[PDB]
């Protein structure tokens, strides 16, 4: 449906990839010394 808000079949290919909030990406506890366990997606997009 073309309601003129979603701009028609353009968006469906990635252009601006939104980064999910850190609350979706909880930084794992420091767990004993400054080495602080990652979480995997943040590693992914931080590679992107």
């Amino acid at each position: 449906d073309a309601t003129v808000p979603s701009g028609r079949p353009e968006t469906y290919i990635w252009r601006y990839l939104p980064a999910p909030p850190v609350c979706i990406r909880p930084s794992v506890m420091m767990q004993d010394s400054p080495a602080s366990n990652e979480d995997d997606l943040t590693v992914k997009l931080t590679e992107i």
Partner: protein, 1114 residues
């Protein structure tokens, strides 16, 4: 006293088990490893030279563990139990010797450590080996410990004996559709490889072999394997006449449409469909291009040089699948034990060792080079002493392996997981319960119907009394009391012997084979097809029992299929038993008096040719008796004892032959969860969670299989005077009812033991974490939240601690973890004190607190706490016999049934368990109990045997009790006579794990996971519980709305979200942030998981944009 031929058979097994211990399986294979294979592994690679300086070499010669050529055993080692406290690893070092090359005309050598092997307790090389009852004390360790379990990083674990499918043999699977795949998966050292072979369509049968590309017609390959006449192929793979004429004829047919005369075409047509040569050494692209692969793909089974052997092999493998295509059945099922071979700890180590070693070289060729790049003067300087630099890839790599249990094997390109398991000491039985446990594996998915149930071929060679619920990927089994697991023997000698006895080599065998006799197979390979099957066998078996080819290398006839297999493969299940030759048995009763007199023992019979290990297949080809009362001149073997059928744990069940099976299976499952004496070192040892009982007692009735495993010197249980009567109402369904003024008299009182280890470890800041403490406010007493500690700032001995107290005070440095610099004027000081607290439902005590230091030199503190649980309401008790239950009301004393001698039955059980469980073996155990105690002899009863019931009564009646247990009782709550009798005598109740005071668990509002925010899982963490997708439906069916919304919403995650009516999306406080507003937004509430889905969605590109409407005005 003439020794009684019927009974005295029994005196075999202990001498058998006295000489050859209960667990050889982990012991002997580990010995055969540390002695033989280690010598062989380097004998495989003794030479490493990288490519440069053509004059260099490093030659391995000798391998030893713990002998540097000083003393007989090691000149120095660490006591194992002491090693169990420090969290160390119990190890003996590896020693090697290398003739090598350094300088001019030199070729020096030495004795060198390459690292440390973690030797196994009570092995050849352990300190414990042959130490007597006193040296045992000086080493501060149990005499009765089964042993055979490694110990690393302070825990022990085990190599769990791991069952494996038959490898390098033939298997044939039929099926609907398909056309009956055959497989032989065959591996020797280099390259495990599978070859599957199957029809594609309509009699047209191909090799699917992932080595090659795909689907070669069997007639082609069969040509290229050297049989070219093609119209004698029918005589070979098909048969003489039969119906196999047309059935096979189709593949022979269209072999014609393509090629012929393999010397070019078929040999080539193979090499046309091969994969690439991987570049170099492609030069042999030829007509003999693939002749390598024909000779060697997976068939390192046969391989060799001329083509006839392999040819007729693949032929006789093709025969069986077309036989299956003629009719189903007539196919080997992957199920029964005969086709399953198990592999002990020795080999499972070796396959890991020679890997880590092969790596050790593969990198050592590298570290030998960075010397040799740069011609620095004349370079020799041995290059050796870098090996220590380069070591512990063999040690630490091996430790980490055996502790974690993930075996990485790139050499076979196959990585197993979950091999070891922590040896579980809840009791003495479990200590050997992780021993004698066979881990089943492979066999694809969980539900698959083929490899699951328990087959009758399993008699006596695997425990029939338990195959519990522990599935996961694969089913778990147990060995018997008597299993001698076949080791490897040898190959060539038995071969050329088989020629000596009159077979004829496959070459001279012409055409018709399947006609003549049966055939003969060696490890699944055809050799001679000897004339006269019978005399051949009987001759041969007569040799196996006397002068040559001993233990395994068994032999058996097969009728349906024509062949006689001879298998020497190791890692295979066996069992002893007695020969009845011609008319009757070979014992003749004189050897038994010649035995327990003390000079005969066992392995002496085998030389005498009396008893011999059998093989699954072989006993199939035998005829076996049970009791000597049955011998027929037609017979062959008689079992030495029937009750050896039940496994180790199963021995605890008295009279297992009076129950049904499920009560034994539940028993053999739970009994290892009882509580008991553990081992004599019980108090000196500190283990993570260790139960134990106050006043244990022998089980009144002993099954003879107890005395073998010494369960009576470490009894787990109480021996409790019980009465079967329905009482109060609290009894009812499985629920026991105990007795005060009885439990208070020290029934079943448990001691529990735990520990919390805290390793004080220094930081790269040159900074130490400190144990100081003891604040002591307001003149002379330590504050309560602390208190209870001591001057040392560490927990002290014997003082009640509960909840907020501190039983070890551990302060850590704050700035230490930061990056130190060459600047400190004064302070390393500031500390963050993070004491660990004892959070528990009940006060407890600190008894033994250890200070030590591990190998890397860092402070290590291990304290152990004990609390003695009174058998409080809601505790699991079990009846040795398959019962289970939990105490109901605890009656005081005066109540409960009493009687003539006023004894007040301690546990008062329930009748209704018996009929629908249908277990009468217990209700015999009772009578045996009341019987025994009155005479004073522990009265035996045992599987398929024991004290007969009918002569019991005559022990009672004369002593004044009913010929059954049933005896009057005066109900104590009234004092009249119980209008029906009651039946009681001492049974043996062993209090279990699953104390309630552990398990009772509750929460108001506890922690939340940062991620989801729902209640966090389990006890420990905190609490909170689970409404599953399955359960939630329930409250739907009732139609309870406000409850459900009160549950999955308010009670769990109650959360506010600010959504913008226009372009619905979530926003914080005021703003929408997609359209700056702080105006059109409306607050409302919503499950936090639901928001978390609106983001984890909306991150991914999608947006459920929320519409809205007001609630009111329709």
């Amino acid at each position: 006293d003439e020794i009684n031929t019927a009974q005295d058979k029994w005196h075999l097994l202990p001498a058998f088990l006295k000489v050859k211990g209960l667990v050889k399986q982990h012991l002997d294979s580990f010995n055969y490893f540390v002695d033989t294979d280690l010598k062989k592994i380097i004998k495989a690679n003794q030479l490493i030279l990288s490519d440069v300086d053509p004059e260099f070499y490093l030659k391995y010669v000798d391998i030893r563990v713990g002998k540097k050529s000083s003393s007989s055993t090691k000149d120095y080692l660490t006591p194992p139990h002491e090693c169990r406290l420090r969290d160390m690893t119990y190890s003996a070092p590896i020693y090697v010797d290398i003739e090598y090359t350094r300088g001019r005309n030199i070729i020096m050598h030495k004795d060198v450590e390459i690292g440390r092997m973690p030797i196994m307790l009570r092995s050849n090389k352990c300190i414990l080996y042959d130490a007597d009852e006193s040296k045992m004390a000086k080493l501060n360790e149990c005499p009765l410990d089964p042993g055979g379990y490694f110990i690393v990083n302070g825990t022990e674990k085990v190599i769990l004996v791991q069952e494996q499918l038959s490898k390098n043999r033939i298997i044939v699977e039929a099926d609907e559709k398909k056309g009956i795949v055959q497989a032989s998966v065959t591996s020797s050292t280099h390259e495990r490889k599978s070859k599957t072979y199957v029809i594609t369509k309509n009699g047209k049968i191909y090799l699917k072999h992932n080595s090659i590309a795909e689907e070669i017609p069997i007639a082609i390959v069969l040509k290229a394997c050297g049989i070219l006449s093609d119209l004698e192929i029918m005589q070979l793979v098909c048969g003489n006449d039969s119906s196999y004429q047309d059935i096979f004829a189709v593949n022979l047919e269209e072999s014609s449409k393509l090629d012929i005369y393999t010397q070019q075409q078929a040999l080539e047509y193979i090499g046309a469909k091969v994969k690439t040569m991987r570049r170099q050494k492609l030069t042999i692209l030829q007509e003999g291009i693939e002749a390598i692969a024909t000779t060697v793909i997976a068939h390192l089974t046969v391989e060799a040089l001329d083509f006839r052997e392999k040819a007729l092999y693949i032929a006789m493998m093709t025969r069986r699948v077309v036989m299956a295509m003629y009719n189903p059945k007539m196919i080997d099922d992957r199920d029964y034990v005969g086709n399953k071979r198990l592999e002990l700890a020795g080999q499972l180590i070796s396959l890991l060792f020679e890997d880590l070693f092969k790596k050790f070289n593969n990198d050592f060729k590298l570290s030998i080079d960075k010397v040799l790049k740069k011609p620095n003067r004349a370079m020799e300087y041995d290059a050796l002493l870098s090996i220590n630099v380069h070591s512990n890839n063999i040690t630490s790599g091996l430790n980490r392996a055996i502790s974690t249990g993930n075996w990485s094997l790139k050499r076979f390109k196959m990585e197993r997981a979950g091999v070891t398991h922590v040896l579980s000491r809840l009791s003495y039985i479990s200590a050997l319960g992780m021993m004698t446990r066979i881990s089943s594996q492979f066999e694809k998915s969980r539900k698959v119907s083929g490899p699951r149930a328990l087959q009758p071929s399993q008699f006596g060679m695997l425990c029939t009394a338990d195959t519990p619920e522990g599935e996961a990927c694969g089913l778990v089994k147990n060995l018997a009391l008597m299993t001698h697991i076949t080791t490897d023997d040898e190959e060539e000698p038995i071969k050329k012997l088989c020629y000596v006895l009159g077979v004829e080599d496959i070459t001279l065998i012409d055409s018709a084979s399947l006609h003549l006799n049966y055939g003969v197979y060696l490890n699944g390979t055809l050799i001679g097809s000897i004339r006269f099957p019978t005399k051949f066998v009987t001759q041969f078996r007569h040799l196996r029992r006397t002068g040559k080819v001993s233990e395994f290398i068994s032999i058996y006839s097969n009728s349906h299929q024509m062949a006689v297999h001879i298998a020497t493969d190791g890692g295979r299940i066996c069992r002893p038993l007695i020969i009845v030759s011609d008319g009757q048995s070979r014992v003749k009763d004189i050897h038994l008096r010649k035995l327990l007199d003390g000079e005969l023992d066992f392995d002496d019979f085998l030389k005498l040719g009396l008893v011999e290990y059998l093989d699954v297949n072989e006993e199939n080809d035998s005829y076996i008796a049970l009791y000597e009362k049955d011998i027929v001149p037609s017979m062959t073997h008689l079992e030495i004892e029937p009750f050896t059928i039940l496994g180790a744990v199963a021995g605890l069940i008295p009279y297992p032959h009076h129950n049904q099976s499920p009560r034994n299976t539940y028993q053999c499952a739970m009994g290892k969860q009882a509580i008991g004496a553990i081992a004599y070192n019980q108090f000196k040892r500190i283990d993570t969670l260790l139960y134990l009982m106050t006043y244990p007692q022998q089980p009144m009735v002993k099954t003879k299989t107890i005395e073998l495993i010494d369960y009576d010197k470490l009894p787990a249980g109480q021996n409790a005077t019980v009465a079967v009567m329905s009482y109060s109402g609290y009894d009812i369904e499985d629920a026991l009812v105990l007795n005060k003024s009885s439990i208070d008299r020290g029934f079943g009182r448990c001691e529990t033991r735990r520990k919390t280890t805290t390793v004080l470890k220094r930081y790269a800041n040159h900074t130490q974490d400190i144990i100081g403490g003891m604040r002591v406010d307001e003149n002379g007493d330590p504050i309560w939240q602390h208190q209870s500690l001591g001057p040392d700032g560490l927990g002290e001995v014997g003082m009640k601690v509960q909840s907020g107290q501190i039983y070890i005070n551990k302060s850590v440095p704050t700035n230490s973890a930061d990056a130190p610099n060459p600047n400190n004027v004064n302070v390393q000081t500031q500390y963050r004190e993070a004491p660990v607290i004892y959070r528990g439902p009940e006060p407890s005590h600190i008894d033994q607190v250890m200070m030590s230091v591990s190998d890397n030199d860092q402070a290590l503190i291990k304290v152990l706490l004990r609390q003695n649980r009174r058998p409080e309401l809601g505790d699991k008790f079990s009846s040795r016999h398959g019962q289970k239950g939990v105490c109901g009301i605890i009656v005081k004393q005066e109540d409960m049934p009493f009687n003539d001698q006023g004894i007040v039955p301690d546990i008062i059980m329930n009748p209704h368990g018996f009929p629908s469980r249908m277990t009468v073996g217990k209700m015999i155990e009772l009578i045996s109990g009341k019987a025994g105690v009155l005479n004073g002899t522990l009265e035996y009863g045992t599987c398929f045997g024991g004290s007969k019931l009918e002569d019991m009564s005559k022990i009672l009646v004369d002593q004044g009790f009913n010929y059954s247990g049933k005896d009057m009782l005066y109900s104590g709550i009234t004092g009249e006579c119980l209008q029906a009798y009651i039946f009681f005598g001492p049974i043996y109740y062993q209090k279990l794990k699953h104390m309630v005071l552990d398990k009772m668990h509750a929460r108001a509002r506890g922690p939340r996971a940062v991620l989801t925010r729902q209640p966090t899982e389990g006890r420990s963490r905190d609490g909170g519980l689970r409404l599953g997708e399955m359960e939630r439906d329930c409250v739907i069916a009732y139609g309870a709305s406000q409850l459900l919304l009160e549950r999955l919403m308010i009670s769990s995650d109650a959360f506010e979200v600010d959504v913008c009516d226009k372009c619905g999306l979530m926003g914080y406080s005021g703003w929408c942030t997609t359209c700056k507003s702080a105006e059109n937004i409306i607050k409302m509430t919503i499950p936090y998981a639901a928001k978390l889905l609106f983001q984890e969605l909306l991150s991914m590109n999608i947006a459920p944009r929320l519409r809205l409407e007001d609630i009111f005005q329709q």
